[PDB]
Write a protein that binds this DNA or RNA. Sequence first.
DNA 1: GGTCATGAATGACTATGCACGTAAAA
DNA 2: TTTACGTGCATAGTCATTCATGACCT
Lengths: 692, 711
Amino acid sequence: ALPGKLTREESELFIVEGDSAGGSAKQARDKNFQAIMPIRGKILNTWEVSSDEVLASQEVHDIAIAIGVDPGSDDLSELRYGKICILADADSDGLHIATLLCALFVKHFPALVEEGHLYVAMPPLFRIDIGKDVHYALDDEELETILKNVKNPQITRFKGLGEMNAIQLRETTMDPNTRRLVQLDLDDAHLTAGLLDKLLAKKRAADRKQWLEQKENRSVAEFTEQAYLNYAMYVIMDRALPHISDGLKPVQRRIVYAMSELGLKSSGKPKKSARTVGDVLGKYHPHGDSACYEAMVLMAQPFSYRYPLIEGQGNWGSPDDPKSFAAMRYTEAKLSAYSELLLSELGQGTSEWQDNFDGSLKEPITLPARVPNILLNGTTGIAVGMATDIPPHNLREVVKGTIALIRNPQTSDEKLAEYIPAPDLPTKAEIITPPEELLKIQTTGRGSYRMRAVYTIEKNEIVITELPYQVSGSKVITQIADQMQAKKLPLVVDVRDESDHENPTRLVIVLRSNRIDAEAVMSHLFATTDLESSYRVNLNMIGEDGRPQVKSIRRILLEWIEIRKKTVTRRLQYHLNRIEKRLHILAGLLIAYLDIDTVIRIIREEDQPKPVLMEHFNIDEIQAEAILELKLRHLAKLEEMEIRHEQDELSAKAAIIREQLENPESLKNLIISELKEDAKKFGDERRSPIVA
Amino acid sequence: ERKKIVSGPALPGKLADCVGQTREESELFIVEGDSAGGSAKQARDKNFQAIMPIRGKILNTWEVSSDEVLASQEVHDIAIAIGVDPGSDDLSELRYGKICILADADSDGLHIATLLCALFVKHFPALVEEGHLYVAMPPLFRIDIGKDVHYALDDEELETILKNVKNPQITRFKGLGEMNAIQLRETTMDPNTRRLVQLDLDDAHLTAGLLDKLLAKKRAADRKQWLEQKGATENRSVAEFTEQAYLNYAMYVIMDRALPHISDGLKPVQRRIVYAMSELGLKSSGKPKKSARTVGDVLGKYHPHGDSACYEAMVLMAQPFSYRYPLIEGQGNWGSPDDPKSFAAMRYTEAKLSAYSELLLSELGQGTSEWQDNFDGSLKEPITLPARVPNILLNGTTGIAVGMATDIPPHNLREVVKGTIALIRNPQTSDEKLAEYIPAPDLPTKAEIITPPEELLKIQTTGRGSYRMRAVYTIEKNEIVITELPYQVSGSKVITQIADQMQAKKLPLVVDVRDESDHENPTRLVIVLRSNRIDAEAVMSHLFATTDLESSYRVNLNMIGEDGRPQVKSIRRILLEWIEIRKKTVTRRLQYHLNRIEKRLHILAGLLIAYLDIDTVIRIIREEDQPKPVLMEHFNIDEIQAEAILELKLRHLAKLEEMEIRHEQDELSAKAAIIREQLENPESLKNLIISELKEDAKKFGDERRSPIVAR
DNA sequence: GGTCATGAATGACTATGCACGTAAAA
DNA sequence: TTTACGTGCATAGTCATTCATGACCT
Ligand SMILES: COc1c(N2C[C@@H]3CCCN[C@@H]3C2)c(F)cc2c(=O)c(C(=O)O)cn(C3CC3)c12
Ligand SMILES: COc1c(N2C[C@@H]3CCCN[C@@H]3C2)c(F)cc2c(=O)c(C(=O)O)cn(C3CC3)c12
Ligand SMILES: [Mg+2]
Ligand SMILES: [Mg+2]
Ligand SMILES: [Mg+2]
Ligand SMILES: [Mg+2]
């Protein structure tokens, strides 16, 4: 009956997204004829689930029990409500859930939208306040519509239902006599059921990819497609996929940038995690804080990140149990020194900047990597229509690669592979794939590679000291003892996890007699436990072109170098265009230092003395002021000859620079040197060796 | 051995056990909380040391019966883990050689060790007696003088280490969660370098005598008194240790947690929040900003504690229906009066400061408050706020410490500003006379205060007492319309209370209860009687004694006063004592602005002195090696005034900017005069403060909401 | 053909310290 | 008399399910 959680055509059920809007709407509603219900989290994709299974999922079950109908049942006779309304966020995840919702309907309750009982409530994206003359904007288009028409107006963005007070909620989406509200119409089944299948078919993701690259009342179909597209593109671009420059997803950059702006350089002390995350949401990334903090754990985990961006203090998980990390109220962290490579050149105008979600700040669109992080750190996420997996690589190995690629851009992949053989993982276990096939993986982006734990033999016990990337010692001990219980192995006596401060890993497997052929047991285990494991390779990522591509290893390096060339440039432009504007001021200054007396005369003698100084010395608006802002202490003969040498340095530094810009070839040497440098600073030897 | 049928309890599993089965080579660390769990589980030596999280504060078992003790799951696992039966000397099956209490080196950590000792002293004496109980002492600090580390258990040992000490960098271990495995290992776990006290239960009498005194839900009396009275290389006594430890806790939670200070009238979690909000510049005139950033900053730099706990104490200050005068203004879902705890999660909401809040904060940048080092000496925080008004009696506080608590009803601003303006002039005002001004509480509701005056005054002159409130209703036909509920009574609870009577045939005289409420009508509970002939007066003056439509309210004017000590204080007393605080605050402020005006006046002096012979000024700098001494000797002006001239921008050499700095001399000269009169003359000060109260009781004031009534 | 796991997105439950006065009962 | 309530500020692990996809698994 739904207790607690929860004429007849005058009635309307309000299905809102999440316990926030739950409380709010339940308030906002008109008690007489408006019932409320939170849909909590994303509901299951029902499009391929049997009406009978569909009710097994509780949050789904509850909707049926509420509307008083049944999945795959024409029996609308007990229908509890006149109008059923999908009350979602204004954001993407908002419309996604709605899409996931229409799906539960169109498929399992077609009858409903057929007779037209399904409505998508339309909450405002904005709220403007001219003097007191309120407006609401459902989107970007209407905002402009309203803006060219009026005191000066004051925007507020509605980043979602929970941050809207009930009074503005009722007026905009609840009370019928002001609520924007679409009557979604199914129409033909075939175009519909056809279109949504393409969309939510766990089997059909392939067409989706394409589709994207190709792509009052509204139609269920027209709408649930307009939405799901909005969704897809967002999670491809602005969530699950890295950009190539720095190799970072957005929550990833937003964290790392936020951490910079809280002054958390590696050289200093750590600061509570709550506050970093507290700032990340507060000003750049308004979503989960848990999600955030967890994405911030990964970056700080030695065993998950080949080159950590963050250095945590306290419990940040163990190699054995990554997810065992302590709550954010406990951990403190700062930045990794390796994160210098992503940030040190930020102040120096090397990056686009865009905004933040309320225009009150600006956040950088990418960071100025001094190295190609996307390959060293690598990534692993799932979007829509596509996903991405990218193996960590050795800094020094990849630097050589790029150094080579800079010099000779036609370098065969066969050659390149001689520089960057294979991923280099955070452990010492062996990467056991044939050269041939790794080269295939690299040249093709798609592929797969295997790792094998490392052992020796001692009597009737097998001694293991290295497990493969991301494999928990215990889970191995589990898998092993499972076969023992299943009695698939009658060969083993015990599995002792020795281990300590001295040996990070030390799993002893004890056979029966000093007569058994461990080789077989180990060879067997390899082919039945995680002591041997396979690893996905899908080099997808957003490229400089702003679009998602699956790229080669040589391609990725080539393209990156085009991004580093453009960066070092922006940067020299930056430094120069200051040295100029500055040498300019110096120039005019020691012009006054000649006739210093006149300047003082002109000042004491004149009302507006600025134009006098311009006419008299032939100096412009900008130099006139540098002089008027020259403290008396400066008139000293010392501090005079001092700003004459400062001209010397300045003017030489400038020549050195504009030569660098001028000459594509003396630039490459700069970038080649700046690679060779950091590979020295932050480089490390290989860990996971390569075998047969 | 054999294939038994009845089998023992599996083992807690949240126990991370050792592998070595020898009895004495073993040890169990009982660590406070899941973070310290994982970290200890890491630091420990797998072989002979097992680990087990205790999560939360375990129940106080000093009066729970051995049979009942295993009721409580968290207590169940300590018994199942050590393998021993409560109130039983049967140690013959005991799983570990040492039981080690490993808590935070904070106040709360010392409390969870006290409760733990109780559990043992009382239900496992045998164990404690055979000396199997131990207390690991994690260090509170790590000093890194050079390349050589030093650890200090507490403050005394930090004093010793640094005064013997090229610069020391100190680090506070705010608690185990944030230690790293290596550091934990070295300091608390690993035998050959760990500080580890053995606890002795050598004479039960003293001991159980003492623990009764602290841990018995009735002797709160003796605790209050006891408090006012007190303010393995080594072994200690369970009694020696738990007294030391329970006292630290009792002290801390009184002073630095539950009770408010008299000045601004806040508990620390509250003040730290509000300050943190100020420091984000979340001024009332400006836009709100995600709550998760406010709390993010609060635990980040001031209050090193739970974020939820903290966030929630923040919710309260935002709620129009619980704070008489909100200190925060909440945007988005912040609860309904009918479901106060229904508030959105913190990732959702944004909030800025109450306009009101300026009364606590406006005067902060102007040398009014003391400042103390935050918890890592990298920022400062105000010890109290410059409350312009007496917030403590306006908004009120409600809390429970140890050996005492504190309950304090909100009041009307205007009545209380009146009530003090009085006391400022007449410090002898009778309670009676003052009570004329401050008749009673003023709650965020329009329901009526139904306690006798004769009796409300006793509440005010003893600080202790009790007053009751009642809902406002009307009769229409055979239905009772209710519009005003008492302070903190939920419409729903009422409906529910009501239905329980119907449901148990105790009120067959009502056939329905409908809640009508809405935008235009805040509250309207309708009760639907049966016959129109029934006497609704009875119905209701029956309900008034069986639902919370008439509900009682606790008064206990306990707080920390200027003395830094807890007291219970008359309403009269409070305001008198508060005046002496605003006196001292206003003072402090005028000295601040003065001492800046003067320092400036001084600069202007030596300044227009140069304007005379400005040319000499220029030659002397152009002429000398270091011009400072010369200007000084030549113009007769000091090191300070010399620099000033030396930092005189050329634009100031214009005739305009000269006459200009003349005026400014005149301006200031007057201002400072007004100010020193005010300092100099006690009665002109009162006049000032008198004035500022009137201003504020105009600017942020309001009329009474809950009326006073007789029944 | 059917499961699994991967990291980013969409927070309410639950037990307990403490004082101590109201309320319902033995 | 006694036992069950409420109160705020302290001490987080658990739960479902999107989306893409290759390898177990059983
Ligand atoms: C886990 O302990 C808590 C419980 N209980 C649930 C647990 C189940 C196991 C045994 N009982 C405990 C008590 C609870 F109900 C609430 C909170 C809680 O709100 C909180 C916080 O920071 O807000 C922190 N904690 C823990 C960090 C102390 C809570
Ligand atoms: C209760 O919602 C969540 C569930 N449960 C909710 C669903 C219905 C009731 C319980 N069963 C499922 C799982 C869950 F398992 C995980 C998370 C979660 O991780 C999360 C976050 O912010 O990180 C937020 N939430 C809340 C925003 C919903 C989660
Ligand atoms: Mg949202
Ligand atoms: Mg989560
Ligand atoms: Mg603690
Ligand atoms: Mg809590």
